[PDB]
Design a protein around this ligand. Structure first.
Ligand SMILES: [Cu+]
Ligand SMILES: [K+]
Ligand SMILES: [K+]
Ligand SMILES: [K+]
Ligand SMILES: [K+]
Ligand SMILES: [K+]
Ligand SMILES: [K+]
Ligand SMILES: [K+]
Ligand SMILES: [K+]
Ligand SMILES: [K+]
Ligand SMILES: [K+]
Ligand SMILES: [K+]
Ligand SMILES: [K+]
Ligand SMILES: [K+]
Ligand SMILES: [K+]
Ligand SMILES: [K+]
Ligand SMILES: [K+]
Ligand SMILES: [K+]
Ligand SMILES: [K+]
Ligand SMILES: [K+]
Ligand SMILES: [K+]
Ligand SMILES: [K+]
Ligand SMILES: [K+]
Ligand SMILES: [K+]
Ligand SMILES: [K+]
Ligand SMILES: [K+]
Ligand SMILES: [K+]
Ligand SMILES: [Mg+2]
Ligand SMILES: [Mg+2]
Ligand SMILES: [Mg+2]
Ligand SMILES: [Mg+2]
Ligand SMILES: [Mg+2]
Ligand SMILES: [Mg+2]
Ligand SMILES: [Mg+2]
Ligand SMILES: [Mg+2]
Ligand SMILES: [Mg+2]
Ligand SMILES: [Mg+2]
Ligand SMILES: [Mg+2]
Ligand SMILES: [Mg+2]
Ligand SMILES: [Mg+2]
Ligand SMILES: [Mg+2]
Ligand SMILES: [Mg+2]
Ligand SMILES: [Mg+2]
Ligand SMILES: [Mg+2]
Ligand SMILES: [Mg+2]
Ligand SMILES: [Mg+2]
Ligand SMILES: [Mg+2]
Ligand SMILES: [Mg+2]
Ligand SMILES: [Mg+2]
Ligand SMILES: [Mg+2]
Ligand SMILES: [Mg+2]
Ligand SMILES: [Mg+2]
Ligand SMILES: [Mg+2]
Ligand SMILES: [Mg+2]
Ligand SMILES: [Mg+2]
Ligand SMILES: [Mg+2]
Ligand SMILES: [Mg+2]
Ligand SMILES: [Mg+2]
Ligand SMILES: [Mg+2]
Ligand SMILES: [Mg+2]
Ligand SMILES: [Mg+2]
Ligand SMILES: [Mg+2]
Lengths: 81, 79, 205, 86
RNA sequence: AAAUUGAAGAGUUUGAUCAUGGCUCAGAUUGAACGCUGGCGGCAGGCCUAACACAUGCAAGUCGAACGGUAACAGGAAGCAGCUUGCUGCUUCGCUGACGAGUGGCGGACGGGUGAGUAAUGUCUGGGAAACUGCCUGAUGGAGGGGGAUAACUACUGGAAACGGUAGCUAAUACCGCAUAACGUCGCAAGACCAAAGAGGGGGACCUUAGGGCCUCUUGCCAUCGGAUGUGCCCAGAUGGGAUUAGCUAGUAGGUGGGGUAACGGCUCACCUAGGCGACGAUCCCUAGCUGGUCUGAGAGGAUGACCAGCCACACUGGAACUGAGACACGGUCCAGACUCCUACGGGAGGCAGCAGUGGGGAAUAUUGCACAAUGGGCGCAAGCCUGAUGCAGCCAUGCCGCGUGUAUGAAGAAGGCCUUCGGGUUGUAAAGUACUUUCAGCGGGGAGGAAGGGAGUAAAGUUAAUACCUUUGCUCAUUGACGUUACCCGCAGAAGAAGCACCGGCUAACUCCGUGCCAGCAGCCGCGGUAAUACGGAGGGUGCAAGCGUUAAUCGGAAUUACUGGGCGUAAAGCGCACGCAGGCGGUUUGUUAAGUCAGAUGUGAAAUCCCCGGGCUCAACCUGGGAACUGCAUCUGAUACUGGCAAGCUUGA
């Protein structure tokens, strides 16, 4: 089904995830429907380490998309500003 | 509205069918000269009204035979 | 990855003093600067236009201690950057950390400043940087490390620096052994004996 | 087969094939009865055969042996042919 | 703001010249290879050939919260006994934690590989109608009452094995009726017809047997209509070469009717019409996966399609269907074929273009590694299990980028080498010597981040008959890292462990001596070598690059040398021997109209990545990354009407 998850990009030992909506069958770094944010797990201080389009995420959830556990945790952290 | 083409009947010997030639005027991609191109379509003509030489009016529809996917709307001009 | 041969042969080939020595003595008293090196050095070199362009480029390279691949990359960056390409190339060369240290006076020569940078004795904005090709931004602070403040060669370089012209785009305090890179040097602040348009034309051949 | 689940899938699919084949034959036999009645020209017999046919194709479509569209096609075609028998 | 800062020539035909014209060179680039040489690190890349054949290990399972059950082992329960005084060992019970085999569900159509085939069946861009769609999601309603089997198992039995055979027993969310039947199907209507499954947690009055239908909650099942996603189908334009391939086609083109598909359709069949395609290149032949992009180029173009991502096709070869929401299915089924293997000779087994690896071919391309810690996927309520995807590690200078191989001083201008008009010059501040620092490598110590979560408790809230269960939100407690001896930081020692390759007549930066004597040899071209060779070979000196440097192959450039931008044809190559003329291209002048070309604006689309601009993070850079710009196109709508086209009416200067 349609899901919201992380595609791993970046370099070796320095991951950088793109938060994307995709048919869950596609490969992790493959075909996706719409990019809705990003998450840098090694972001330096004073640097934006997470950004999500909560309106688009809510729209897709209302359309029936599921959410991966890491993306759910990221949404919780973003909402808890 | 509906997308629609206009052309000239080049054959009407089929039962309820006609061949319509559509002319386009396009710039040559390399030399820049405007040239004429022709596309021939098989068109469904119920009542067999159209004749060879008439300027006719066609629209796109569902497939009706192996080569027919267009149908006649009206006759703009009669030969 | 670094020229390690005799230093005065380069200046003799280029026909001018490249400041490859500290300056305690005279280049004429140390070498036959007016004569090109080698057995046939007394011959009068008829140089073609390509030869003139090449010698100018090699002179700039030998002054700043940059190898060919890095220098070509500098030229590409200078051409990409807006404005006058030759002036951009000169500004990029002057922005190097080893050159900035030498101009600030912590090193007697550019090679000595490069060794000081490499051996982790130089700090930029409070962080240790040991990359000789590091680009120094405006308002940056270049300071000598505390464990290296006791080095006698640093004091010798500092007492040799004021014997030369003071760079107006830097602000150096020798008591604390630290300087500020106020702004990028203009073309006027650099030597007039460098014809960068020759290098620019050479890289279009 | 090299994978245990593949072996089990083969066994299950063969059993499913036998089941499906018997049901498909039964449905086809009833449809053929309707068509033969239409061919004979007996409208009453054709209607009777159609009445016996209709629940069978409906139940098979519900069970998934055929599609609802196929059951509807059979019913529509046979109704159209029966209504012209008058 | 910014995101088009962009364009070099040289040699060679002649005694000399100008032109023409080919050939050759300087540049950039690569999945490269070879020769010589080789210190470190980061990021990436690595069978281009045989879609050749493959040893071995691994690459797809999971669910006991669907079901009958108990092969284990772990308890609980009964007896006996060495008993060592209640610790042990052996039997009986699925009673529990669980679980081998079996039934059932879901997954195995994903993820991964390869480019054989394919020249439009595909791909790209833009449209479209006659369709289905598991898991996810919204709404409205249902979930009643029965039945017959079957695996496992037991007994016997065939066979070397693979694989079976006979009889008997049993369960379900396996299967099949009956009931119910309307925003569903058929039908103008009246009418006719179609479905389902339970499981789990807790519980008082436990309404009845300590369980359950008694209540509640969770989850699951069925029907219909939607959403979302995925898939099937249709049309137009674009997408290689060949005319020393010009005709091709009978299901062929269309029509009617029947059948068929989820769906339109010659998809198929019967009949009727005699059509359909093609110089705007049909048919035939050769080559080829397509795109985003990549290399080159000032641009226009030219070449190209490895890695990354989208699309397609294939899975030992040929063919076929079955199951299924989805396959005509890489690690499924059946048949045939070639190879390999087992056999008791009757008969059986197999498919690395998954990861690693072997043989083979080749100029040439790596380890039979670690872990599911992170991201993602399958199953599961969850815990968790599975995952050669993936994250990492190993090998290789294959590429890009960074750094080091020391710094300062030092005339005795030391020795030695080389040249010398013998005065000297050069190697050369070079070395030695003298003062210094210690990046990297080596040794010792410290030490991030990739970790989110999950598990136990608690308190509150929501539910319900219930302070029970369950869910949610907080708080508390112990924990989860393959990489890994991580990055990084600190300390010790001592310049100590670290430079080569090509070239030096001109193009082209860099010159002499000796050896040889059209020999040996060099060479991209011009050419060099004949006894005073800056061209062969050595040496000294020098030049250019540098952990690389050269050579070979290959593409674009220079080549305005296929010229659209941007060339020529009297004599250099080039005007048909001369005409008439179809198609085609082109069209004097005025008015009106149209709005096709053209122009303006808007909207949708033009995937992401890549390129460019402005920024951010790795000490810098390569690299990673935010936003923009761009994607120069297509379609639609609304406008403009000068020019071109269409239509109508003219005019006389062309005819
Ligand atoms: Cu046998
Ligand atoms: K038709
Ligand atoms: K510039
Ligand atoms: K199973
Ligand atoms: K010649
Ligand atoms: K020439
Ligand atoms: K000649
Ligand atoms: K002459
Ligand atoms: K399946
Ligand atoms: K291919
Ligand atoms: K039932
Ligand atoms: K219950
Ligand atoms: K229920
Ligand atoms: K056909
Ligand atoms: K037909
Ligand atoms: K038909
Ligand atoms: K280009
Ligand atoms: K292209
Ligand atoms: K095949
Ligand atoms: K697959
Ligand atoms: K995992
Ligand atoms: K000497
Ligand atoms: K809690
Ligand atoms: K001689
Ligand atoms: K031209
Ligand atoms: K228009
Ligand atoms: K007009
Ligand atoms: Mg380098
Ligand atoms: Mg078999
Ligand atoms: Mg001559
Ligand atoms: Mg291959
Ligand atoms: Mg396994
Ligand atoms: Mg089990
Ligand atoms: Mg069932
Ligand atoms: Mg019923
Ligand atoms: Mg191509
Ligand atoms: Mg069709
Ligand atoms: Mg091929
Ligand atoms: Mg050009
Ligand atoms: Mg490819
Ligand atoms: Mg094979
Ligand atoms: Mg089926
Ligand atoms: Mg297939
Ligand atoms: Mg399969
Ligand atoms: Mg296989
Ligand atoms: Mg392999
Ligand atoms: Mg070989
Ligand atoms: Mg170290
Ligand atoms: Mg953290
Ligand atoms: Mg020269
Ligand atoms: Mg000689
Ligand atoms: Mg020589
Ligand atoms: Mg050209
Ligand atoms: Mg010419
Ligand atoms: Mg002649
Ligand atoms: Mg001639
Ligand atoms: Mg003539
Ligand atoms: Mg004529
Ligand atoms: Mg005109
Ligand atoms: Mg894009
Ligand atoms: Mg934009
Ligand atoms: Mg007009």
């Amino acid at each position: 089904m349609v899901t919201i998850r992380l595609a791993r990009h970046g370099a070796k030992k320095r991951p950088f995830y793109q938060v994307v909506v995709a048919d869950s069958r596609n490969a992790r770094n493959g075909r996706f429907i719409e990019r809705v944010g990003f998450f840098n797990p090694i972001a330096s201080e004073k640097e934006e380490g997470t950004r999500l389009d909560l309106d688009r995420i809510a729209h897709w959830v209302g359309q029936g998309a599921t959410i991966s556990d890491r993306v759910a945790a990221l949404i919780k952290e973003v909402n808890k500003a | 509205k509906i997308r629609t083409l206009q052309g000239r009947v080049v054959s009407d010997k089929m039962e309820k069918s006609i061949v319509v030639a559509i002319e386009r005027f396009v710039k040559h991609p390399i030399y820049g000269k405007f040239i004429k191109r022709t596309t021939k379509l098989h068109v469904h003509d119920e009542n067999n009204e159209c004749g060879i030489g008439d300027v006719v009016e066609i629209r796109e529809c569902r497939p009706l035979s192996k080569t027919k996917s267009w149908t006649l709307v009206r006759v703009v001009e009669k030969a | 990855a670094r020229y390690l041969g005799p230093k005065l042969k380069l200046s003799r080939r280029e026909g001018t003093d490249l400041f490859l020595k500290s300056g305690v003595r005279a280049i004429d008293t140390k070498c036959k600067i007016e004569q090109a090196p080698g057995q046939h050095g007394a011959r009068k070199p008829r140089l073609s236009d390509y030869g003139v362009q090449l010698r100018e480029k090699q002179k700039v390279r030998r002054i700043y201690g940059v190898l060919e691949r890095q220098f070509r990359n500098y030229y590409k960056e200078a051409a990409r950057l807006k404005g006058n390409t030759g002036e951009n190339l000169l500004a990029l060369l002057e922005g190097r950390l080893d050159n900035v240290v030498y101009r600030m006076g912590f090193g007697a020569t550019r090679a000595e400043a490069r060794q000081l940078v490499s051996h982790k004795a130089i700090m930029v904005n409070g962080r240790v940087v040991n990359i000789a090709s590091y680009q120094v931004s405006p308002n940056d602070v270049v300071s000598i490390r505390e464990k290296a403040k006791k080095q006698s060669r640093v004091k010798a370089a500092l007492e040799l620096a004021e014997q030369r012209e003071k760079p107006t785009w830097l602000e150096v305090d020798a008591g604390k052994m630290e300087g500020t890179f106020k702004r990028k040097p203009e073309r006027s602040d650099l030597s007039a004996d460098i014809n960068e348009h020759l290098i620019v034309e050479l890289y279009s051949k | 087969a090299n994978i245990k689940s593949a072996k089990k899938r083969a066994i299950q699919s063969e059993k499913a094939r036998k089941h499906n084949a018997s049901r498909r034959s039964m449905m086809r036999t009833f449809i053929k009865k309707v068509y033969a009645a239409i061919e004979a020209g007996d409208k009453a017999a054709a209607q009777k055969a159609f009445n016996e046919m209709q629940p069978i194709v409906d139940r098979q479509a519900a069970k998934g042996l055929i599609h609802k569209n196929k059951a509807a096609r059979h019913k529509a075609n046979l109704t159209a042919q029966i209504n012209k028998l008058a």
